[PDB]
Each structure stands twice: as C-alpha cells, then as structure tokens.
C-alpha cells in the first residue's frame, strides 16, 4: 500500500477528514487574524 | 529614476495641504506614520528640490509639538500617556530621518533644536519607561513597537551625527545616553546600534575621550556577570560585550588623509597604555566590598578567544604591550603581593593558550 | 513507519559504501530518477531521518554542486533538498506516516535549535544567488520561498547581515516581475507575511519596500482602470491579458495584506456592474475581482475590533457589504461556471461571516450588519448546489 | 584669467562654509546687516 | 593603385564579392539557365550616382546596402545560393528582388530646413521599387540639432552632412567619417 | 599582426574616451550587464551583435563632443545611447504565457536601474527558444511571425530577415 504519491492529494489529506473539511473555511484565509473572526462565530 | 515625480508628487501634495491646514492640535497618527514611512526609502532621493522656508516652518511645527512630551514625566488616562508617547516617537522618527536623508541640503535647514529634543526626549522615554517594564533590576503592544522605533532613532541619529559638526552641550548629553544602556540586560540591538552611535562620537572629536573612559569605567560594578545573557556578539564562538565596545574604540582612531602615520599610531597606542595601566592599577588589590579579577578574567579570554581574524586587529597590539606591562609591572618589589599574584596568573592562562594555539 | 525506516537502513548498508558526500547524493539522485513511483522526496529522506541525517546535513557541499550536471537533476536536488529543510525544522513527519502525533526528546530540542542555527547562517549567504541562477524557473523558486518560513528572524540583527536582506528583497522583487503562475506569488506573499512580523526589528524596512511594491501595483490598477472604462481599443485581448495578470498578483499580496488605505473595491464595483449589464467579461477577470473584493470586505472589518469604532464607518462598510452582496445575487447566474462555483464559496463565507452569532461575543457594533437571506434566494442556492454538486453518472 | 581664478577662490570659500557647520539659532533672520564692514566690526566684537 | 578600393572594402564583403563571381562564372560555363545571367543586374554601387558631398551620407546610410544585388527573379537568387552553399563559399551575398519588393508608403516632410535624399540620387527608373528601398527613407537634415528635432517629430532616419546621425528608433551612431576611404569617388574617375 | 596592433590602438582610444567624460560615459554593455548562465553567453551576444561595444552615455550632446574628439583620435566610429532622450517601447510582456520559450531580456542581470530601457531597445521582443525545431515551428506557425532565436545563434525576426554565424 503505497503513501500518495503526488503533493494534490497530500494536502487534500492534510485538511482533509469531516471535522477539518467541516472546521475551516472553504477560501483559505492565510493570516491567523482573520482566522479569529471566522472560528469564534462557530458554536 | 531620474526623478519618478509621481509619488514626489503624492507626498508634496500630502505635505503643502497638511501645513496648510495646520497654519492658517494634532495632525492624528495615520499622517505621521505614512509620511515617515514615505519619508524613509520614496524620499530617500526625492527630498531634494523642495521649498527650503517650508521646511523650515514645518520642522519648527514639529518641534512645537515634541515639546508636548519633554519632561512627560510619565484605567484610561494612562493609555492616553501612551498615546502620547507613540505619536511624539512617530514625529521623532519623522524629523530624524528628514534630517538626514539627502546626501545634501542647504546649511541652517536643521537647528540644534531639534537635536536637544530628540535627546532628552530619547534619555528620559527610554531610562525610565523602558528599562523598568522588561527587568526589575532598576524597578502593551506598543511597548515593543516603540522599542524598535527608538532602535531606528538612534541608529539615524548616529548616521547624521557622523554626518556635520555639532555643539559640545549636546555631545555631553548624547555621549551619556550612549553610553547609558550597556548595563541592563536585554538591550542587545540598542548595545550594537550604541557601539555604531560611541564609535562615531569617538571617531570625529578628540577632546572627549578621558570623559569618556572614565564614564565607563565608573559603572564596572553593574555589569551584569549572568551566564545567560553574557556573551551576545555573534561571529558557536560568542564572545562578551564591553570587551568588543572598548576595541571597536582603540580601533577607530586613526584618521587617514607623512607624519600622519606615526602620530596616529602613536596616538592609538598612548590611549591604549593609558586605558591598560587605569585598568590593572584600580584592578589589582583587593578593595573594600569589591572586586575586579572576574571581569579580568573575561577580558583576557575574550581576547584569547579572538586573536587572529581579518576583521579585528589591533588585539596583538593589546597583547603586546599587556605582555611586557604585566613584566615590567611584578619585577620589582614595590607593589604589594595580591596584585603580583593576579598578574602572574594571567599570563600564565594567556602564555598558556598561545602555546595551544601553536 | 517502522517498515520504511528498516528499508532506509537497508539502503544505507547497500549502495553507500565535503566532496565525497557529493557523490553519494548523486547516487541518491539517480535513485529518485529511477523510482518511476514518486514523484516527490519527502519520504525517501523521512525514511531515511533516522540513520543518516549526518549524511542529510552535508548542505555545504550540494551548495558546492549548484554553482561552479542535468537540469533535471539540479531541479530534483533543488526539490529533495527542500525536503530535508522541512524533516530538519520539524520532528514530526508528513502526515499519514507519524503514528504519534507530538514526539520530543533533549537531543532533539538542542538538535533543532543547532540545525536551525546554520541553515540559516547557510541560506542567508546562498539564496540571492540561487533566485539569480534559477529565475526562469517557476517551480524552483516556488520550492525555495518555503525556505524563510523556518528562519529565526533574530539572526538578521545578531549577525549584522542586512545587506543581504536588501538582496533578497531585491531579487525576489525582480522574480515576481518575471512569473505569473499563482502558486510562486502565494508562497512570495506568505514570505513577506512572514517577514512582516511585528516581533522584529527588522519589520519596517521590508514594510517600507513593499510600500513602494505596492505604489507600483496600484499604478497599473490605474492603467487598467482608465483602459476598460474609456472606449480605448474596443476590448482587445491583449489589453484584457495585461489587466488579469497584474489582477492576479493584486488578487494574490491582497490575501495576506492589509491594503485597506488604498480602495481598490471601488474600480472593481465600477467594472463588475457594466461587466454584468453587458454580461460579457473574461471569466479570470471577474473571479479574481470578487475574491479581492472579498478580501477587501474582510481586512476592512478587520480595523473595526481595535476599540474605538467611530459609527460612519460602520454604516458605510454596511453600504459595501450589501452592494457587494446585491451585485453577488445578480452575478450568481451568469453563464460560466467557474464564476458560478467562486461566487457560491464566498456568498457562503459572507452569510458564514455575518450571521447572527456574530453579534454574540460581546459586540456592539455587529448587530446592524447581521444579514439573512431572502428565501427566494435560498431556493436560487439550492437549486444551484441540485444543478451543480448532485451528478454521480456521466 | 583673473574670472577663472577669482571663481575657484570663490568655490574654495563655499565649500568652507558648507563645512563648517556654525548652528543657527533662532535669532538669525532678525539680526540681518548688509554692510560686509559694520559685519567686520560685529565679529570683533563677537571675538572680543 | 586599384588595389585600394579593395582596401576600402574590406575582406569580407571582398570575398563574398569573389564568390558570386566564381558561382556565376559557374553558371557562365555549364551554359545552362541563361535567365540567370541575363537577369543579373549588379550591384547597388554600379546602378547609381551621387554628388560628392553626400558621399559620406550616402554610403553610411546605406551601410552594406550598396552591394545588394539587382536581379530579374527570385530563381537567380537561389541558384547562386545553391552553388553558393554547395562549394562551401564563404558569405555573403544579398539579392534585390524584383518581383518581391515591398516598400513603405511615405510621405515626405515640406521642411526647409531638410532636403529629401532621393532628390539628389541619380537611378535606373526600371529598378524603382529597389532604390525606393534601400534610400527613399531617410533625410538629411541641417544640423544635430535639427536632425534630432525632425527625426523625434517624424518617422524618419536623419543624417547631417558631417556624419551626425540618429535613428528613427533612437539609436545614434557616429565618428570620425574619412574621405579616402570612400569607393563612389574612384568609380567616378575611372 | 598589424590588426592586432590596430586593436590595442582602439582599445586604448576607447579607454581615454572613458576616463575623458568619466559621469557621462558609463561603459560597455558587457561592463554594466551580466549573462544569467554561462550557457547563454553566446546566444546573448549573437542576438545583439553590433551592440556589444554600445558606449552609455547621458545625453546626445556629450556623446557628439566625444565623437569630435574621437575625430582628432581617428577611432572607429562609436554608438551611444543617451538614456534621457532614447526613445523606447514598453516591454511587451503578453509572449510569457508561451510554453517552451522564454524572454531573451529575462537571462541579464543589470547592475544599474537606468539601463534597463537601453536593454528593452536592445532586445525588445526577442525570443529564446530550447532547441532549434521548437524554435523553427514557434518562428514561423504563428498567422505573425515572431522573433525567436534557438541557443545555437541562428536568428529569425519578426520580419522574415535572417541572419546566422
């Protein structure tokens, strides 16, 4: 069972899975400080 | 370019509207920041072919408006202190560059005014707001932000300082503020632009420099003697502070432009003789309440630590003349014992380590 | 982990019995050639992190090889090499190999301060010329920008090196000048993000460069701006090429930056509302306005947190929102689809934003901009996502 | 030539009093005499 | 004696001069394709005539334009290319096609303080679109100051008289221009 | 033989000239101009040919006095190109997106900012191509033809002229 070989589904499988699919935004949003508005509105 | 005048332009446009809405009290704290920072790399070569009485009213305006600060004396009111505090180092920055920036500039564009604010202004701000806040020796976000400013502040006002002559009332006070942040502990930026700031002051007039010394030597008691903290000189292979301030000196005077070669060499190993005979001689006996050999000792392994690198000599010259004072010094039988015993042994690490080094 | 960290002590045993280490690099190389497998190194040298690091730290002499050979050799070496840096900054592996995820040890806390020590020493002095040599090259370069995010940005002030910034700087300025494939300008922009931070002395010159980076960028905004308004030369395609590319790297610094003293919202509204009355504008284009319109709208409310919020901001950022929203609504139909699928991430992100739980914590300012959609537009979005999510057979 | 000569002795004084640095204060604009004579005796007296 | 017109052409045109020679005398003596010496027109240099002022002008706008080649077609051009590559001759050779020739539209400034070059060229009017070519575009203007003045105004080459030049694109090239050197004069007093 | 003496005769004029008017004569274009690669060293100075030895200077005026100069020297005739009233073209830059060539102008690294619109005028659109079928195709199967040169120094431009060695 070979690991992925390309870097596409490398990071897919980084933020991939239900809870990081389900917990970030679906426009990345490189800088931390907009990551606080995003993350506190989410009960 | 040429001359780009289209941000020339932005900036000249941003300066006649400010001034003239300001003659006909703050200018608010967006203004200053871009217009210094507009100042520094724009107006690194647009600061020329300007209107020079302009200037000449508009730096008076900022002065009137530093002196709001000097002397601050410094749950709501504190971080309106603060505030102050920001804008009036925003100005700073903003003078100190305007000052400076072009390789040339009519005479009388800048008045030692201007000079004895940002000093005091420096001295009072950083010895009794910095200091306190990061060690308890002496004793939010913008208490680092001014830390870099004042870095910047001090570096520029070496840079002009080096730059044209100036008047001894201010020397006083700028040499005193130079040499003051040498001995707390987390300075280490402040310590390197410093050694920048007191090389420059020790390069250009010769008159100052038994005040000098002997203002450094008062404070040998302060110095820190942490492990953490002691060597911060990059070049592995750290080295101490003092040791580093005090060669980077010996080494700056030699004044190139015949005879000059000689009275400068001359010149150079006088003071050094002086400076090594004060040192041993307060050194050696055992005083009351304090000692001297520890700082000694790390000195001289400092010194062993750096012996032959292209980009400090004048150390072999050190050692000479240590060498033959230290025989000359514990030959005879007029001093007293412990002082002959110190000696001895430090030539015998610093002999030692040469033949290793061999 | 296990199996492959075996099979790299069997590697080690069987083919490698400053110069002599060159050597077993090159038959690395040939080794990475041959794997018709992968395609990237990152687990040859994570397999290999155990036994051979010393070999791994021989940064020195691959320095060496690069200056005074295949090009693809140079570019997997470049690749591999990157690899390495990250395996070095880092303990623990790529996901999907590291059964645990925290792992620290003494000698691997004194080891990462060492290593972090003269990497950088290394590739302050090495990568000026490297950006130089290479600059043609967009995955090269876009390998070598995710060098700095590991630097300690102390060691510019200690070592008395900023001169070699300035280099830096200056290099990278002219790559940017040279490329437009987007992930080279995402991995720039993140560096200057990086070196941005307010921790360092060193933050206010590159802030000041970028400045100047930025005058230059606006000013083609206002070449583009001024030539898709006027009648001009009729919307000819090269003048649309020149707008998207410099619309691009916009698009890609506005990510990471707060560009909100300059309004560039505004040229974008002014283009989008004719572009939709026409309705015949370059997909790129418009993407790439509404992204960094969306960018603009999130830095903007950035600024509104600090403590003191003035209200004639407040409502005319609420006139922003609810135009940009208004023009959104009426571009979700247009006829291409990748605009389609863009303006429903971000109208999801904007509802995300400006929901009612945003006024929650402890906010004053936030109840006047809680907006909820018309139904009529949520049955629009749910027929969008049945028309365009919903397809298992070709 | 006497112009020649003259204008390098002229370039010879500018660059003195662009090197010299003598610190204005706020009292100059004011105190503006025109003579070059009476100014010689004011600079005596500031000798003095 | 003669020799010096050879010096004041150099080596290089010299031989690739020679070696049409020889690839025509090849055509000459198999007796085949006719056409191709009957069609062959010479040189620039042999198909004109100028004022001795201008000789300096003339020749330097025309750099290595005065030895293109007039011919009838384009099958004589490559027939001498064909010998030409085939006995390893070493270059070059330039051809005026006739059937070929395409040139710019211009129209020429009424300035009094310029002169229009083609005015004071003499040519064979069956070869119109050649000369039209090669000189009908730059003009020679009163001074450097009006050669830059008119050459930015218009889009045009201009020259003076001493040898100033500047370039319809902005390149200025110049230097010391001999008179001996020239090779229109000794053409003329044989 | 006699032309290398005549060369040392040139060299030196051309160095006197430099020292003469030492702000306005900035150099060569080798002095101020750096090849990227060793590799591309002959193919750069095959598309510029004549230009190698194109003398900066400041203004028309200054360069006409040097050719005056020059005059009593007895040099070869020089180029200059005054950077104030050169009159260049913005880089067309819309050829990036071609995938197997690459911008001739994108292997010099320039030490000084002015010269960079000298070096524009030099190359303007000029292409560099991998190999020579590449370069023969993407020269002429465009509807335009380009200028595109392959790394073996045979020249193509836009305008159908041809030229090698």
Redesign the interface.
């Known amino acids: 069972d070979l690991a992925p070989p390309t870097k596409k589904l490398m990071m897919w499988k980084e933020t991939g899975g239900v809870e990081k699919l389900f917990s970030l935004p679906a426009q990345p949003l490189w800088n931390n400080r907009l990551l606080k508005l995003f993350t506190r509105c989410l009960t | 370019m040429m001359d780009s005048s289209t941000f020339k332009r932005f900036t000249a446009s941003i300066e006649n509207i400010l001034d003239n809405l300001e003659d006909m009290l703050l200018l608010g704290k967006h203004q200053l920041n871009e217009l210094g920072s507009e100042s520094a790399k724009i107006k690194a070569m647009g600061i020329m072919d300007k209107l020079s009485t302009d200037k000449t009213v508009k730096v008076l305006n900022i002065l009137e408006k530093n002196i709001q600060d000097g002397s601050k004396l410094s749950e709501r009111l504190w971080r309106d202190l603060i505030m102050e505090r920001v804008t009036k180092s925003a100005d700073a920055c903003l003078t100190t560059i305007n000052i400076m920036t072009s390789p040339n500039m009519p005479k009388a564009v800048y008045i030692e005014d201007v000079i004895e604010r940002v000093i005091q202004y420096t001295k009072f701000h950083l010895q009794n707001t910095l200091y306190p806040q990061y060690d308890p020796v002496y004793r939010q976000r913008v208490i680092v932000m001014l830390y870099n400013k004042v870095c910047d502040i001090v570096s520029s006002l070496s840079e002009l300082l080096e730059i044209q002559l100036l008047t001894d009332t201010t020397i006083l006070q700028v040499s005193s503020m130079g040499i003051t942040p040498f001995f707390v502990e987390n300075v280490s930026e402040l310590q390197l632009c410093a050694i920048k700031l007191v090389t420059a002051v020790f390069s250009r007039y010769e008159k100052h420099r038994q005040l000098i010394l002997e203002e450094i030597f008062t404070s040998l008691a302060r110095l820190p003697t942490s492990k953490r903290s002691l060597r911060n000189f990059r070049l592995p292979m750290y080295i101490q502070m003092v040791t580093a301030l005090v060669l980077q000196l010996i080494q700056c005077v030699v004044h190139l432009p015949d005879v000059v070669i000689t009275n400068s060499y001359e010149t150079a190993m006088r003071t050094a003789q002086n400076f090594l005979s004060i040192f041993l001689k307060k050194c050696g006996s055992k005083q009351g309440e304090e000692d001297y050999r520890p700082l000694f000792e790390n000195f001289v392994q400092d010194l062993l630590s750096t012996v032959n690198k292209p980009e400090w000599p004048a150390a072999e010259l050190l050692l000479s003349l240590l060498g033959r004072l230290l025989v000359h010094q514990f030959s005879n039988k007029s001093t007293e014992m412990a002082l002959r015993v110190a000696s001895l042994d430090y030539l015998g690490t610093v002999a030692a380590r040469l033949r290793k080094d061999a | 982990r296990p199996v492959a960290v075996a099979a790299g002590e069997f590697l080690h045993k069987k083919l490698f019995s400053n110069s002599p280490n060159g050597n077993l690099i090159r038959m690395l190389v040939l080794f990475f050639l041959e794997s018709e497998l992968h395609e990237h190194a990152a687990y040859l040298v994570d397999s290999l992190w155990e036994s051979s690091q010393e070999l791994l730290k021989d940064w020195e002499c691959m320095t060496e090889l690069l200056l005074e050979m295949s090009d693809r050799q140079e570019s997997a070496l470049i690749e591999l090499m990157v690899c390495t840096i990250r395996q070095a900054a880092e303990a623990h592996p790529p996901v999907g190999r590291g059964t645990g995820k925290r792992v620290l040890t003494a000698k691997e806390r004194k080891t990462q301060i060492d290593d972090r020590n003269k990497l950088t020493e290394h590739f302050i002095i090495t990568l000026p010329m490297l950006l130089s040599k290479y600059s043609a090259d967009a995955e090269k370069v876009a390998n070598l920008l995710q060098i700095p995010q590991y630097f300690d940005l102390e060691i510019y002030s200690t070592g008395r090196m900023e001169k070699h910034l300035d280099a830096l700087l200056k290099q990278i300025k002219f790559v940017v000048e040279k490329h437009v494939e987007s992930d080279v300008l995402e991995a720039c922009s993140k560096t200057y993000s990086i070196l941005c931070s307010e921790e360092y002395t060193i933050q206010n010159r590159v802030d000041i460069a970028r400045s100047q980076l930025i005058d230059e960028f606006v000013d083609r905004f206002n070449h583009s701006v001024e030539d898709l308004l006027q009648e001009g030369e009729e919307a000819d395609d090269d003048d649309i090429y020149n707008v998207l590319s410099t619309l691009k790297r916009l698009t890609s610094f506005h990510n990471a930056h707060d560009l909100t003293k300059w309004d560039l919202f505004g040229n974008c509204y002014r283009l989008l509302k004719t572009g939709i009355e026409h309705g015949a504008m370059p997909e790129q284009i418009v993407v790439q306005a509404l992204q960094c319109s969306h960018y603009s709208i999130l830095w903007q409310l950035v600024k509104i947190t600090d403590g003191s919020p003035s209200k004639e901001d407040l409502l005319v950022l609420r006139k922003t929102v609810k135009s940009f929203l208004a023009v959104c609504q009426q571009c979700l139909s247009n006829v291409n689809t990748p605009v389609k699928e863009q303006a429903f991430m971000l109208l999801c992100d904007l509802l995300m934003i400006f929901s009612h739980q945003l006024m929650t914590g402890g906010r004053e300012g936030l109840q006047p901009l809680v907006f909820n959609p018309d139904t009529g537009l949520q049955s629009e979005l749910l027929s969008f996502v049945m028309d365009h999510v919903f397809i298992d057979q070709d | 030539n006497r112009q020649g000569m003259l204008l390098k002795k002229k370039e010879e004084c500018m660059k003195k009093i662009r090197e010299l640095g003598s610190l204005p204060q706020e009292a100059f604009e004011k105190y503006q005499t025109l003579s070059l004579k009476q100014l010689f005796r004011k600079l005596e007296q500031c000798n003095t | 004696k003669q020799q010096l017109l050879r010096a004041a052409t150099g080596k290089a045109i010299l031989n690739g001069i020679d070696s049409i020679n020889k690839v025509l005398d090849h055509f000459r003596r198999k007796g085949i394709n006719q056409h191709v010496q009957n069609g062959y027109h010479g040189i620039v240099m042999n198909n004109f005539e100028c004022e001795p002022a201008f000789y300096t002008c003339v020749e330097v706008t025309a750099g290595n334009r005065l030895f293109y080649h007039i011919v009838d077609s384009d099958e004589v051009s490559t027939k001498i290319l064909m010998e030409f590559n085939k006995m390893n001759l070493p270059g070059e050779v330039t051809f005026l096609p006739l059937n070929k020739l395409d040139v710019r539209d211009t129209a020429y400034p009424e300035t009094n303080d310029a002169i229009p070059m083609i005015s004071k060229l003499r040519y064979n009017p069956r070869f119109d679109k050649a000369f039209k070519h090669v000189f009908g575009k730059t003009l020679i203007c009163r001074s450097m100051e009006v050669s830059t003045q008119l050459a930015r105004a218009f889009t045009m080459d201009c020259i003076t008289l001493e040898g100033d030049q500047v370039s319809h694109r902005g390149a200025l090239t110049g230097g010391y221009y001999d008179t001996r050197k020239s090779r229109l004069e000794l053409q003329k007093d044989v | 033989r006699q032309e290398s003496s005549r060369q040392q005769r040139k060299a030196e004029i051309m160095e006197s000239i430099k020292r003469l008017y030492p702000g306005s004569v900035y150099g060569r274009l080798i002095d101020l101009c750096q090849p990227?690669?060793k590799k591309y060293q002959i193919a750069v100075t095959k598309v510029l040919g004549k230009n190698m030895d194109a003398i900066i200077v400041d203004s028309?005026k200054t360069?006409?006095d040097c050719?005056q100069y020059?005059?009593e020297?007895?040099?070869?005739?020089?180029?200059?190109?005054?950077?104030?009233?050169?009159?260049?073209k913005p880089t067309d830059?819309?050829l990036?997106?071609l995938k197997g060539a690459?911008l001739v102008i994108?292997?010099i690294?320039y030490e000084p900012?002015?010269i960079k619109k000298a070096l524009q005028?030099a190359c303007g659109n000029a292409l560099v191509c991998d190999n020579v079928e590449d370069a023969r195709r993407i020269a002429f199967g465009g509807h335009q033809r380009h200028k595109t040169v392959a790394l073996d120094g045979t020249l193509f431009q836009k305008s159908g002229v041809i030229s090698g060695?």
């Open positions: 990227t690669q028309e360069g006409r050719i020059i005059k020297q007895r040099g070869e005739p020089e180029t200059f190109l005054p950077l104030d009233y050169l009159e260049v830059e819309k990036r997106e690459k994108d292997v690294r900012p002015h005028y060695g």
